[PDB]
Write a protein that binds this DNA or RNA. Structure first.
Length: 107
DNA sequence: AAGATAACGATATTTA
DNA sequence: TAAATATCGTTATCTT
């Protein structure tokens, strides 16, 4: 239902190695039920970087505050200043961390 | 049961 | 103007 899986993800690494990082249309011939750019989205957010060992540090948290209000939601450009995390990873984590940063009013 | 992460589709923007 | 690209946004699934 949600498409993809580990078996297909492993094939991605092989496909990217053989087809390249632009001929995603070739992969779209084997997988048509997905946006071609999304196949790249996974490669770029899983096998390309090393988004692990916890998120960013508080130093980045307070830095990203400014490194965002200057270049809108250009996470694509922000990930370049923080050599370690990618788009769908930072965006996800930003909204995630914001849920804790924004506190929780009650009484 | 609730929370967190991941992935796929679409919209908006940019370039051709 | 049309097409192509990237990030965004939401839901589903999985883990704790």
């Amino acid at each position: 239902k949600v498409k993809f899986t580990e078996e297909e993800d492993l094939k991605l690494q092989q496909l990217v190695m053989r087809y390249g990082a632009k001929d995603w249309i070739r992969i779209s011939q084997l997988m048509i039920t997905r946006n071609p750019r999304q196949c790249r989205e996974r490669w770029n957010n899983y096998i390309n970087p090393a988004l692990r060992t916890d998120p960013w540090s508080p130093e980045e948290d307070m830095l990203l505050d400014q490194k965002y209000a200057e270049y809108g939601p250009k996470w694509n450009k922000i990930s370049k200043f923080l050599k370690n995390r990618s788009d769908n990873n930072i965006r996800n984590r930003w909204m995630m961390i914001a849920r804790h940063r924004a506190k929780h009013q009650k009484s």
